[PDB]
Amino acid sequence: IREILKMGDERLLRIAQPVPSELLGSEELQRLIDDMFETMHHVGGVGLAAPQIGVDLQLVIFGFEPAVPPTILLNPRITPLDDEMEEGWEGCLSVPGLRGAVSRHRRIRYQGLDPQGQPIDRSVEGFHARVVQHECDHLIGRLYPSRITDFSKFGFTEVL
Ligand SMILES: CCCCC[C@H](CC(=O)NO)C(=O)N[C@H](C(=O)N1CCC[C@H]1CO)C(C)C
Ligand code: NI
DSSP: OOOOOOTTOGGGSSOOBOOOGGGTTOHHHHHHHHHHHHHHHHTTOSEEEGGGGTOOBSEEEEEEOOOEEEEEEEEEEEEESSSOEEEEEEOOTTSTTEEEEEEEESEEEEEEEOTTSOEEEEEEEHHHHHHHHHHHHHTTTOOGGGGOSOGGGOEETTTO
């Protein structure tokens, strides 16, 4: 288990470095991955990005049993597939006790590498696209409050 960094920590604000090709397939990467899934499962998350546990790497995990397959995504690139935007509720492990409505692209393509270095290339919609976009934002130092445009919908979970 690792400790989840909280909003205000400068490490959530950095642009993350790519996973080097040296680490693809490695034991060391695999152990980081196991540690991430163990952390995410312990606190109930649907996703987790490496910088949230203080590892400066373009690596994300996500999934849950709107079903999203368990997935480990390295070095990602996201491409919006059209202009359609949708609002949905988000919260974040790094921003405990809050929720906010955020407008994200409805449809994206995402690509990157799996942990063995095999390419990933998928086009998704709705909740799956929302999760990817949230997680990838961590890799460019963006948390969801910096994406809100309707502040009438941002507030404490226990109030909302
Ligand atoms: C959909 C927004 C992406 C959520 C990703 C976060 C996990 C996280 O810290 N990602 O880096 C999460 O699991 N958040 C949960 C969350 O936002 N949920 C619970 C299930 C769906 C959604 C509803 O707000 C919890 C912490 C409240
Ligand atoms: Ni988050």
